[PDB]
Design a protein around this ligand. Structure first.
Ligand SMILES: *[C@@H]1O[C@H](CO)[C@@H](O[C@@H]2O[C@H](CO)[C@@H](O)[C@H](O)[C@H]2NC(C)=O)[C@H](O)[C@H]1NC(C)=O
Ligand SMILES: *[C@@H]1O[C@H](CO)[C@@H](O[C@@H]2O[C@H](CO)[C@@H](O)[C@H](O)[C@H]2NC(C)=O)[C@H](O)[C@H]1NC(C)=O
Ligand SMILES: *[C@@H]1O[C@H](CO)[C@@H](O[C@@H]2O[C@H](CO)[C@@H](O)[C@H](O)[C@H]2NC(C)=O)[C@H](O)[C@H]1NC(C)=O
Ligand SMILES: *[C@@H]1O[C@H](CO)[C@@H](O[C@@H]2O[C@H](CO)[C@@H](O)[C@H](O)[C@H]2NC(C)=O)[C@H](O)[C@H]1NC(C)=O
Ligand SMILES: *[C@@H]1O[C@H](CO)[C@@H](O[C@@H]2O[C@H](CO)[C@@H](O)[C@H](O)[C@H]2NC(C)=O)[C@H](O)[C@H]1NC(C)=O
Ligand SMILES: *[C@@H]1O[C@H](CO)[C@@H](O[C@@H]2O[C@H](CO)[C@@H](O)[C@H](O)[C@H]2NC(C)=O)[C@H](O)[C@H]1NC(C)=O
Ligand SMILES: *[C@@H]1O[C@H](CO)[C@@H](O[C@@H]2O[C@H](CO)[C@@H](O)[C@H](O)[C@H]2NC(C)=O)[C@H](O)[C@H]1NC(C)=O
Ligand SMILES: *[C@@H]1O[C@H](CO)[C@@H](O[C@@H]2O[C@H](CO)[C@@H](O)[C@H](O)[C@H]2NC(C)=O)[C@H](O)[C@H]1NC(C)=O
Ligand SMILES: *[C@@H]1O[C@H](CO)[C@@H](O[C@@H]2O[C@H](CO)[C@@H](O)[C@H](O)[C@H]2NC(C)=O)[C@H](O)[C@H]1NC(C)=O
Ligand SMILES: *[C@@H]1O[C@H](CO)[C@@H](O)[C@H](O)[C@H]1NC(C)=O
Ligand SMILES: *[C@@H]1O[C@H](CO)[C@@H](O)[C@H](O)[C@H]1NC(C)=O
Ligand SMILES: *[C@@H]1O[C@H](CO)[C@@H](O)[C@H](O)[C@H]1NC(C)=O
Lengths: 50, 220, 85, 198, 149
């Protein structure tokens, strides 16, 4: 799974089977990292109109 | 069922009989009109492609579609602010009500701004605001809600303290019963009818305003 | 600002008329470029009392302009010639 | 920037036409944006695919242009209907509608032709040089309440007069410009003043 | 594959912009109507029927609403109507009398003149009537005295 974003701590109580999370657009919003099993929230990098 | 069009009323027409009203009701009715929408802007390149350089390179083969869509959305966004200016910003003077609310029995507390509220809105406006609930951005409106409320407050102060004079030029003060008598003459009723029944008219107006607030608070 | 971050314009506490709209009550002008909360208008406390009226003693004959568009340029496009030549 | 409203319409139409013709220079994923180059360079089995890409791109551009023109035409039609309403109600008559025919009390209007537009010169009456007066709803005389027939009771401090509402023209309170309805016990704020009899 | 995604997303975005422009036209028409109501009902008294509420319009109050305006139209509604016998003119001294501003009504025995929108009977005099012609032309003229002050 490829993408760009900021990886932050999360408070989403994932169930043991659950690995990642998806928004309405189906883009991944949270992921469970391998090796360490922690749950990292994925927040898109800052953008906006100039 | 087959819907009824109305209650059936037969008018008692004859060639020499007329019906004359002996009383009146001061009726306050609500009319809700939308003014603006949410100002939405969509980054066409980011919506179609995101951060992919190859996708944008392929998107440049289609030309200036993205420029057209951004220009149209920008036109809509400025049109919403123009609509709000046209509706609410029709006075260049911010009129204020006097501290003493002596209007000859007429009560405007439900439509004048409440000093106790930090938003400086009327109780009716506060109830109205309570009852309404990937490259996309929402632009804030140029006029905030407190400034729109301030414009409505200025319009209310002008129409209460000056009648229709502030809309045609300088604001000329007039007592509110006298202004109501002028409005009575506008609809073809003599001034005496307003003056003789001034307490009754003020009571009916206050009751109708309270019924408006109750009807808004009781209807989803 | 609520509209976003503004770089290069100094914020002032004075209120003027809106020259360049920024958003969320914020407008910009040139005097350097300043940013301010837009003034809705001048305050005018009408001297209301229960027995006083204001009567005009004079008048101004004012002529104002109103510009309204009526028509556009009548354009015709040959669909076959545009797409295919 | 006086005639910006007409200039915006002209600029939008010219810009839409310019963008529509600019869309011909785009290949829309084909090898070239020129049909003649594809016909001279390729055999028909691949040429049909290339012209198919160019046709769908140009057709989408033309449909977008026609849709924008229809929306702008609807806006201009609404503006023209408003202008026809102003021509009927401000020029061909005097309008009581507030702010429909200029700021102030509307007197008359004059039409002027403009490129793709109309300019209305609204001649309006604006009150000026207002003066404070002490006012009363009615005049109590001989146990009767007198109300103004068309004007308003004003007082300059010592004497009471009746004047028209939109211009200060004080006149003596007589029985010709007032009417009698009821006694003085009902009207709130009635003041005592004489009423002249011609 | 990216070309397929681009053409699908571009079609979706063009569709969204098309209905946004149509809704913008509708909202602009509604806002122009709201500005007209603000000018004519709040800043003045309108003679237009049903433009500023049901009934004879007296005045109006604007209230701000989220993305909108609410007009409180204060109007005058006639009530408690009563039958009266009416005539177009009063015949007196061989002359036809017509009301200056009101209407001739009769409660059964006596004739009065009243304003049209409220019952306020007054004695038929020369001050509130005007004379035009004799009694031979007006259809339905009745005989009653006209008081002279
Ligand atoms: C004026 O008089 C007419 C007839 O005298 C009244 O009309 C009648 O009203 C009653 C009550 O609803 C009906 O049952 C009759 O059918 C009506 N008759 C006709 C011919 O329509 C009328 O109500 C009176 N107006 C008022 C205000 O009392
Ligand atoms: C006109 O209607 C009003 C109500 O709209 C009448 O006022 C009522 O009068 C009765 C008795 O006089 C009271 O019990 C009510 O409390 C009054 N209501 C209000 C709201 O004040 C009024 O009397 C009527 N006048 C005529 C001449 O019929
Ligand atoms: C004007 O109306 C307001 C509200 O309709 C009146 O305020 C009420 O006052 C009574 C007695 O003082 C209280 O019991 C109510 O709770 C008040 N209502 C609200 C919503 O605060 C007010 O008294 C009226 N008169 C004046 C002169 O303001
Ligand atoms: C009518 O009288 C009032 C008060 O007597 C005048 O209002 C004052 O005007 C001065 C001059 O700007 C202000 O400094 C005061 O603050 C005003 N007082 C109030 C209570 O508003 C008013 O200007 C007079 N009208 C005219 C036309 O002269
Ligand atoms: C009403 O206002 C007009 C101007 O709007 C006044 O006319 C001016 O009067 C002064 C002094 O008499 C002259 O110096 C000006 O040249 C006049 N201007 C014009 C355009 O004629 C007029 O005097 C005012 N009337 C009253 C009664 O105050
Ligand atoms: C109010 O207006 C009246 C009428 O213009 C003034 O009465 C006149 O005042 C002048 C000035 O001294 C006298 O020469 C006249 O004889 C007065 N006429 C009458 C019929 O008495 C009155 O003075 C004005 N009052 C104020 C306070 O300005
Ligand atoms: C206006 O005039 C009337 C009568 O001319 C005054 O009414 C009198 O008031 C006194 C004292 O209040 C009473 O003793 C009389 O009985 C009243 N007479 C009548 C016929 O009502 C009234 O006070 C005067 N008002 C002003 C402001 O001068
Ligand atoms: C029509 O109205 C008139 C005036 O209100 C009535 O005339 C008065 O009636 C009362 C009660 O009978 C008498 O005390 C008065 O003396 C009458 N006035 C005059 C000048 O005669 C009349 O009775 C009413 N008619 C009907 C049928 O209601
Ligand atoms: C109203 O009054 C006129 C005149 O006072 C009446 O006209 C007269 O009617 C009688 C009876 O028919 C005739 O003999 C006279 O020649 C008429 N005179 C004139 C000048 O026309 C009329 O009949 C009365 N109408 C009613 C309904 O009472
Ligand atoms: C390797 O990944 C597994 C989960 O697949 C995990 O349990 C284990 O701790 C990981 N080991 C190391 C050394 O990261
Ligand atoms: C106007 O208010 C004053 C008090 O400020 C009062 O004395 C007077 O009677 C009032 N007049 C009317 C007509 O209400
Ligand atoms: C009204 O109709 C009656 C008959 O029903 C008739 O006698 C009378 O003259 C008519 N009046 C008018 C003014 O037409």
């Amino acid at each position: 799974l490829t993408g760009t974003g900021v990886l932050t701590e999360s408070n989403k109580k994932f169930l043991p089977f659950q690995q990642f999370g998806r928004d309405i657009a189906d883009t991944t919003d949270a992921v469970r990292d391998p090796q360490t099993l922690e749950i990292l929230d994925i927040t898109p990098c800052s953008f906006g109109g100039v | 069922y087959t819907m009824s069009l109305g209650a059936e009323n037969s008018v008692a027409y004859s060639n020499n009989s007329i019906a004359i009203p002996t009383n009146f009701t001061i009726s306050v009715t609500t009319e809700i009109l939308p003014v603006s929408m949410t100002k939405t802007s969509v980054d066409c390149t980011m919506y179609i492609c995101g951060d992919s350089t190859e996708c944008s390179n392929l998107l440049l083969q289609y030309g200036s579609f993205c420029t057209q869509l951004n220009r149209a959305l920008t036109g809509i966004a400025v049109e919403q602010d123009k609509n709000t200016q046209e509706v609410f910003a029709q006075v260049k003077q911010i009129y204020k009500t006097p501290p003493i609310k002596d209007f000859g029995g007429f009560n405007f507390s439900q439509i004048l701004p409440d000093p106790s509220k930090p938003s400086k809105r009327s109780p009716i406006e506060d109830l109205l605001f309570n009852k309404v609930t990937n490259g996309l951005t929402v632009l804030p409106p140029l006029l905030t809600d407190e400034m729109i409320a301030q414009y409505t407050s200025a319009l209310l102060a002008g129409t209460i303290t000056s009648g229709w004079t502030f809309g045609a030029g300088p604001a000329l003060q007039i007592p509110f019963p006298m202004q109501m008598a002028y409005r009575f003459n506008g609809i073809g009723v003599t001034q005496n009818v307003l003056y003789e029944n001034q307490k009754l008219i003020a009571n009916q107006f206050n009751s109708a305003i309270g019924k408006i607030q109750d009807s808004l608070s009781s209807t989803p | 600002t609520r509209a976003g971050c503004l770089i290069g314009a100094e914020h002032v506490n004075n209120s003027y008329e809106c020259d360049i709209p920024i958003g969320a009550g914020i407008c910009a002008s040139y005097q350097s470029i300043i940013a301010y909360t837009m003034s809705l208008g001048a305050e005018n406390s009408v001297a209301y009392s229960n027995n006083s009226i204001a009567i005009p003693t004079n008048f101004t004959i004012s002529v104002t302009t109103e510009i309204l568009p009526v028509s556009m340029t009548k354009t015709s496009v040959d669909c076959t010639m545009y797409i295919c030549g | 920037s006086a005639l910006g409203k007409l200039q915006d319409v002209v600029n939008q139409n010219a810009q839409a036409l310019n963008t529509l013709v600019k869309q011909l220079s785009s290949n829309f994923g084909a090898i070239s944006s020129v049909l003649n180059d594809i016909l001279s360079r390729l055999d028909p089995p691949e040429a049909e695919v290339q012209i198919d890409r160019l046709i769908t791109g140009r057709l989408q551009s033309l449909q977008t242009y026609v849709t924008q023109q229809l929306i702008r035409a609807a806006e201009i039609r609404a503006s023209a209907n408003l202008a026809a309403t102003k021509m009927s109600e401000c020029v061909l008559g005097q309008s009581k509608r507030v702010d429909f025919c200029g700021k102030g009390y509307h007197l008359m209007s004059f039409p002027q032709s403009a490129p793709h537009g109309v300019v209305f010169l609204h001649v309006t009456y604006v009150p000026a040089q207002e003066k404070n007066f002490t006012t009363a709803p009615a005049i109590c005389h001989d146990g009767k309440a007198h109300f103004p027939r068309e004007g308003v009771f004003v007082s300059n401090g010592t004497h009471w007069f009746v004047t028209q509402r939109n211009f200060y023209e004080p006149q003596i309170i007589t029985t010709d410009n007032t009417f009698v309805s009821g006694n003085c016990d009902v009207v709130i704020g009635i003041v005592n003043n004489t009423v002249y009899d011609p």
